[PDB]
Design a protein around this ligand. Structure first.
Ligand SMILES: Cc1ncc(Cn2c(C)c(CCOP(=O)(O)OP(=O)(O)O)sc2=O)c(N)n1
Ligand SMILES: Cc1ncc(Cn2c(C)c(CCOP(=O)(O)OP(=O)(O)O)sc2=O)c(N)n1
Ligand SMILES: Cc1ncc(Cn2c(C)c(CCOP(=O)(O)OP(=O)(O)O)sc2=O)c(N)n1
Ligand SMILES: Nc1ncnc2c1ncn2[C@@H]1O[C@H](COP(=O)(O)OP(=O)(O)O)[C@@H](O)[C@H]1O
Ligand SMILES: Nc1ncnc2c1ncn2[C@@H]1O[C@H](COP(=O)(O)OP(=O)(O)O)[C@@H](O)[C@H]1O
Ligand SMILES: Nc1ncnc2c1ncn2[C@@H]1O[C@H](COP(=O)(O)OP(=O)(O)O)[C@@H](O)[C@H]1O
Ligand SMILES: [Mg+2]
Ligand SMILES: [Mg+2]
Ligand SMILES: [Mg+2]
Lengths: 540, 539, 540
């Protein structure tokens, strides 16, 4: 019975919206929400820090198409949780942060962990609101959900006072709500679709720029049909990896700088001309390059660089339009244009310049030598998580993707500390696929304690640490008087993160010699549980 | 060879197609107003930043390009927040240009130092400080794009004093271009057909017209749709004129019955916010089905679940539906029970009100006074309205024939927009008369702008319905008024007409209903601003 | 009964805190609060704009020593009201803004005038909070009051939802609260008091800087005893006027620039080294000037200019300490030092440079000629309100003050639009004293409609408008095509604001000839009600 409590109703509302997992760290006043989630069919993962819980929620949202959810305690719980709200806002990922709030009737008294939580969360959110009654919990979870996954996805925050979590409400008084339907689709006008193909027809050096917005739209099939039909070369953002297969002959990634610099028409597909693509401006682009832009957010059209043809709407639906329109066209990009020859030639020279490093078996291993074994060992159906600077940037050029939404990295915000949260999100989003987490030694220190979480929930994430002893290469040894003589970027060289995984009950392997890398990787993969292979890296 | 900051921001406003600039000058923005005049941007100096920012917002709606206001440091911005909020709420495009104190005085307590981006941000789609002269064009372009693309809204630009006075070589200025008209998105073919399918099966279909369709400038497409389908319609106050009010398919005179009984409502650029009572019982059938046409995806299903979503531009999507209606024989028959019920109820409601329309006893009531206003309204007028009873009754009795020709308190229900919005109407199209219908309380928020009307020769015709308060007041001011005067009460018959006379316009005071039309005609004939002050019944 | 409604309890709580007047503009949902105020002994003034209501509240707080209160409607009411919060924050004046809020159970639905009101008001406030229940209304009004008048005074905001205003509560369930006592006083350590007198002893050119913080502290008597005992010259901020009598022989105001430039010790008494005193820095000050600073706010000590001796605490209590300590000292500033001779000599030259303008009877009048008649006509016990640029800045040098807290002007924020709000606050704070409002023609246009309020409440404010046809001097006539040819600063020259006062039922007088100014002033003063004398001003 006849009555529902606040904790039960918010958990029930998460399930109603199709949210199957909940990340958090319990304590006053939200422990009952986690308990209620488990009884309402929502799996709960108790993390070691709200940072990881909120970052996992954000990535889980991207992977599932419904909002990710995290639940955090009053005060410092929300402050820690802001990390995830910012990351979801920046990446255009859907999430709900549920923040506990102190008793409503203690306002102004200095209650335990009293904080202006809607105020401090609002800058990161599409929608942020306090829940004033049990009866309207379903309304607020529905509204948060809609604002998270409609349009440009983003972050949302809900404040749940302690006396609301513990309050109760008759069933006939609960607000009516419904599962938020899959987002409505908008498509381009016919003339815009034709104008896009017209511009491509005239291009001497066309280039497609693939971003994770197309992965979020789940239009990889439409994109693949388009690229195959038009035979236009493509480049890709790090998490746009896999929308097209990296090992496709039309990939210009190995000649990326030349491609952007010389293209006369770029086709943005769910990608922004922000820092990742160097703003679409010289010296990285031709000053007169013309832009075809496909984005769901109207305000992004013409950002930084004017757009010639705007395709505002859903990536999958609009790419379907272009494929249908290509039936009535003879045009395709010839296989032997100077454009294709130039990109092929430069790609080969760049790969040749790097080959000596790939084949260098001298120890300690460099990035390219270590990643040679990782690349050969990657399962084709793996979800790849990557975090770091050199380890991440080189790792994602050397590890090819074949499926979309199968790369998770530092993202638009360049955040360190998302690593194991995003790995854990990948692992619970699809337990049938292996999850590889490639990390630098600095990155793993932000969230390393989540290794305990990996063992606790039997999540067999395979971690590979490339260890050069710092944020970038460190020093050969720790000097005396380190507070003044140790480089700010330096960490213990060869710090035994493998022994940390062992400590909690996983498989840790320490590798100093390149010849032993692949054996460690195979052993880590065979272990039925989480593993960490700690590879000593050259500092040169 | 060199451009100064004041000149470059004025030049950038012109580049973006912004032809007027409202403001109140003073440190440090006077040079921006002067530069606007030299760059082809007309400047109107107002008497308060409230009116300037409200005018900017309405000007944006009327022109399709952002309205612009310029205000001084500190309190200038705080006053200007009023307009940012109103533009945010109405989904209207504007740029507020706020002067900022010297960058090198940060933290010292400079004259009118304030955290202006901080305090303006909650109201804005985009808010940013301009750090250099060279990137002025970049920021004005970005503000413009964010103001008029998608759901339109407010934007704020901070201009430090040393930037306004700074200079930059031409070869170093940021490149920028006029922001093109917003790109259009349309509905998938199946959604268009699903919309017509739902209307076909409806026993009691109803179209809800909002000002988003007016902003989209799709009145022609809407008119073709209503005529083809013969579906009745209701309208928001500023949605007035998208369809002509005097159309046989208007259900406005039976609005409560229509909303309560419809089984399919078609939202056209209208929200199920307070204006349409959230789409919920007791004002709607609990099982009503919704067709929703809106440019903002997040609005789809707000408060009430949507059956068919048409996300994109109103004009473009209504064109789709009209083309698709060629492949259908269906239209709503003229003699359905629905049409008969609405016709019957409309007639009973009009009959209930007629005794008040025809009551010639003085002092006049709302309906008697508005009888003369309605007969006197020019067909091509832009109507500005502000108040409570004066506004709500005025907009039911004064029929609109053109879109974007009604300006009222809007989504935010703001008092103080009156003369700002009237002035925006007057400079947006000087070839059309502008009527401002106001209550006596409303005119007190912005009344000093009458001086602005005379100064710029703007012939706004003001009609004040004067009942002596926020709603009816008292017959006289009692003794010890701080304790005995009702909080809502104002001087009954306060001579706002003599205020217009004071500044050089035509003021006429009318206490007898038989003299109302003569005063209106005389006000209209005067070649300048006018105010007819009509004593209203307090019962 | 037995039960109290929200409107009644907040009005009752205002009275409990000693707030005797309430300014506002009624409408949904706060009309009941204004009605309740009148029955609880709190006078209500219904204004024509929330700007004036909030500005009046702020000045009323300064004048009364208890917080001023304003009540505004939902949404735009609060947005308009922010003007007053900012002005109270900037001037260090106590006020409570009571903002109506939409129904709690309509959150997120788009209710009539729904707004994030605590969010948008917080930047201006020492304390801002929503009132969640009727029972705790007294608590929140007490807490707002304490934060408004303790320490550095400032602005506070209280959010009152519609369903709280209309809600009710049993008397036994109402929160207990008490009248906030007069602020506790802090004083300086004995060594600091002696160090201050030591520094003054050694000074060759000492100068006292009097600010309105001393007026707020109501320590004018202690200051007057100190100046008379030490015979140290003084300057004064515009609203610091009257702490010392302006016509005192130790006033250096007529040589203000020289005084600040040459002083070797400045004694800040409730004054900031912000823009009003030119930051205490060269070229306006000696580079090596030493500072004695008396302020209640510790963070202000050493702001912009290092402080030699800090006197942190209440101005009245600390000045009492210095007077007691001066009993054990022989030192005083000699009457014939080069310092005194230099200031006397420069003052005389500055007054002589201006005399031709004071005596210029040619029409139209200039500032100094018009203010000659105003000065002779000012009642000695008047409260002077001033607003404008030239009209205000010249007016306050020519119109001498004899009492503290008897000048109200644009203040720290330099705000236009405070004029009639502050005049009205003066008029209801002490009906036994005349109130003069000196205004430029631009300033009166910000709040001019409040003339109706003056007639409605029989407030006999005497307005004097110096009319030069713009923000500063305008043009002789309005040109053709004014949107392009009228100077941005220009207004109708000689706009008949006198006829606006006549319109509403006051006494308006238009003066073009200087010889008629005093007759108009006398006639305005004799009229038993509000008056406006509109004086045509030279544009040169
Ligand atoms: C929250 C946060 N803190 C710090 C950084 C700065 N940062 C840091 C600390 C990185 C670590 C790089 O070191 P690594 O060991 O992970 O990888 P490599 O040594 O192979 O470059 S990459 C990077 O941008 C960041 N982006 N985000
Ligand atoms: C900024 C602000 N202040 C106050 C209000 C409240 N308000 C006020 C003060 C109105 C005035 C209505 O009185 P009127 O004389 O304009 O018209 P009627 O007397 O004919 O109702 S209508 C209304 O909503 C508001 N909406 N916005
Ligand atoms: C809210 C606001 N808007 C604008 C200004 C700028 N401003 C304005 C508009 C002033 C008016 C000066 O003109 P006046 O007629 O009051 O006086 P004078 O003509 O005698 O200088 S003084 C001043 O600083 C301001 N300070 N505050
Ligand atoms: N369904 C969708 N269809 C098209 N564009 C979308 C869709 N969802 C999101 N987007 C857009 O995709 C873009 C993703 O940009 P970004 O995060 O910079 O990608 P990347 O880092 O891979 O370059 C955003 O501008 C976002 O608005
Ligand atoms: N070009 C457009 N096409 C369709 N809808 C639009 C367009 N521009 C804005 N809108 C939408 O129109 C709606 C206007 O709603 P609202 O202001 O509530 O109208 P009203 O007050 O007249 O009912 C908003 O939801 C806005 O997103
Ligand atoms: N009771 C008090 N005793 C001493 N200083 C006070 C007291 N109340 C306020 N103050 C301080 O007085 C100062 C007033 O400064 P300000 O407003 O700049 O004055 P003015 O404009 O007259 O120069 C502030 O720093 C404030 O903290
Ligand atoms: Mg490293
Ligand atoms: Mg009225
Ligand atoms: Mg002037």
């Amino acid at each position: 019975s006849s009555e529902v409590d606040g904790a039960t109703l918010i958990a029930r509302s998460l399930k109603q919206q199709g949210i199957d997992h909940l990340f958090g760290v319990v304590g006053f006043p939200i422990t009952a929400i986690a308990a209620a989630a488990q009884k309402e069919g929502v799996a709960y993962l108790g993390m070691r820090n709200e940072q990881s819980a909120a970052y996992a929620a954000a990535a889980y949202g991207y992977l599932t198409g419904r909002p990710g959810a995290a639940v955090v305690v009053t005060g410092p719980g929300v402050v820690h949780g802001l990390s995830g709200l910012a990351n979801a806002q920046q990446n255009c990922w859907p999430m709900i942060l549920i923040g506990g709030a102190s008793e409503t009737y203690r306002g102004g008294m200095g209650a335990f962990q009293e904080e202006r939580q809607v105020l401090i969360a609002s800058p990161f959110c599409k929608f942020a609101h306090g829940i004033e009654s049990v009866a309207r919990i379903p309304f607020y979870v529905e509204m948060a959900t809609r604002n998270a996954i409609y349009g440009r996805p983003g972050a949302t925050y809900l404040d749940m006072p302690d006396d609301i979590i513990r309050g109760t409400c008759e069933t006939d008084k609960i607000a009516q709500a419904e599962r938020v339907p899959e987002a409505p689709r908008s498509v381009a006008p016919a003339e815009n679709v034709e104008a896009a193909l017209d511009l491509l027809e005239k291009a001497q050096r066309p280039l497609v720029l693939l971003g994770k917005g197309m992965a979020w739209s789940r239009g990889e099939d439409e994109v693949r049909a388009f690229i195959e039909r038009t035979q236009v070369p493509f480049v890709r953002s790090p998490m746009g990896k896999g929308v097209m297969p990296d090992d496709h002959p039309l990939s210009a990634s190995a000649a990326r700088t030349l491609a952007l610099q010389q293209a006369d028409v770029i086709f943005l597909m769910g990608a922004r001309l922000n820092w990742i693509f160097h703003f679409g401006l010289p010296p990285r682009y031709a000053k007169d390059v013309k832009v075809i832009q496909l984005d769901i957010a109207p305000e992004e059209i013409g950002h930084n660089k004017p757009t010639e043809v705007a395709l505002v709407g859903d990536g999958k639906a609009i790419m379907a339009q272009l494929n249908k329109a290509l039936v009535n066209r003879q045009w395709f990009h010839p296989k032997d244009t100077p454009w294709r020859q130039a990109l092929t030639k430069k790609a080969a020279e760049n790969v040749a310049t790097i080959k000596p490093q790939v084949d260098d078996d001298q120890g300690p291993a460099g990035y390219y030598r270590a990643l040679r074994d990782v690349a050969a060992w990657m399962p084709k159906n793996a979800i790849l998580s990557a975090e770091g600077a050199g380890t991440m940037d080189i790792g994602l050029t050397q590890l090819a993707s074949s499926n979309a939404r199968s790369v998770l990295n530092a993202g638009t915000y360049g955040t360190m500390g998302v690593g194991l949260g995003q790995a854990i999100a990948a692992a619970v989003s699809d337990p049938s696929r292996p999850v590889i987490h490639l990390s630098g030694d600095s990155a793993i220190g932000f969230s390393g304690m989540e290794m305990e979480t990996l063992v606790r929930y039997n999540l067999p994430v395979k971690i590979v640490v490339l260890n050069n002893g710092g944020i970038g290469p460190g020093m050969p040894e720790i000097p005396e008087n380190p507070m003044f003589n140790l480089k700010p970027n330096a960490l213990i060289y060869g710090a035994r993160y493998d022994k940390v995984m062992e400590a909690f009950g996983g498989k840790g392997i320490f590798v100093k010699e390149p010849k032993d890398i692949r054996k460690a990787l195979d052993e880590a993969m065979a272990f039925k549980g989480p593993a960490l292979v700690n590879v000593v890296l050259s500092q040169g």
